[PDB]
């Protein structure tokens with residue numbers, strides 16, 4: 001109980017910033033995550049023995065894929081940690097608990113393929129969950145790990161608090177389905193502008209938490225340029241493997257997934273920053289002003305991709 005996690009001074013300072021990179025030392029990521037739960041939530045909110053056992057079961061259930069891996073899980077949780085810490089009073093004790101866990105678990109047992117590829121392959125998961133296929137699986141896996149003996153980090157919550165947290169986590173994980181992000185952000189844009197946004201309206205909280213999840217999930221675009229650029233290699237390694245599998249089914253994949261159209265990556269990054277990332281962090285900054293450093297970092301990286309196109313790198 002009087003056992004803090006401490007980090008070396010550089011990490012202790014930099015972990016508080018939106019652009020923190022969790023480093024190449026895998027064995028420190030669990031400690032980094034417990035550090036964030038302790039500072040974000042209290043040293044009390046989970047029994048260490050149970051938390052540490054949930055963390056290692058979650059790690060074990062991420063696969064060795066280029067991008068949708070254990071590093072991604074902890075990176076996304078850290079972004080959520082930065083948002084919660086910069087918006088201290090806006091969130092309930094239960095939301096802070098559930099959202100860090102939601103982020104850690106949001107891509108559990110990802111195989112490196114899109115919902116589209118599951119459906120065209122006719123994977124069993126596409127029969128079981130007709131929309132947000134992988135995201136319903138991720139939530140299902142989360143619940144299965146919570147039910148292993150010694151793994152219920154939420155044991156000390158009341159029955160109603162327990163149903164509340166698992167409902168926060170389910171919505172948070174489903175919101176990471178980027179097909180749902182576009183409509184969710186439009187509605188938030190409309191509600192912010194017409195001044196109808198009400199953080200006491202549960203369905204309004206839900207939409208805002210959904211935009212936070214999209215923001216945390218896309219956070220490679222808010223890092224220092226070299227992190228952003230090297231993460232993009234990992235993203236394309238999955239995209240192009242999926243394209244290869246599309247060609248095996250006799251289907252010409254979208255250019256995003258076609259390693260033959262590697263040349264046009266820079267222009268594809270502009271499209272993504274303009275269509276997805278910039279609007280996402282803009283609406284998030286409007287709703288939560290202290291998350292502006294994500295929008296500012298995203299704009300800097302857009303400007304770096306523009307320089308790649310102009311042959312300056």
Ligand SMILES: C[C@@H]1CCCN1C(=O)c1cnn(C)c1C(=O)Nc1ccn2cc(-c3ccccc3)nc2c1
Nearest residue numbers: 178218220221235255256261262264265268269272
């Ligand atoms: C939703 C999935 C799950 C994994 C993250 N994700 C993302 O979308 C995602 C998350 N972070 N980042 C940086 C991306 C990303 O790079 N996204 C995109 C989006 C559209 N594109 C089109 C083209 C293109 C390339 C060559 C030629 C022509 C086009 N490249 C892209 C890249």
Ligand SMILES: [Cl-]
Nearest residue numbers: 039040085088
């Ligand atoms: Cl604090």
Ligand SMILES: [Mg+2]
Nearest residue numbers: 106107134176
């Ligand atoms: Mg996902």
Ligand SMILES: [Zn+2]
Nearest residue numbers: 072106107217
């Ligand atoms: Zn993700």
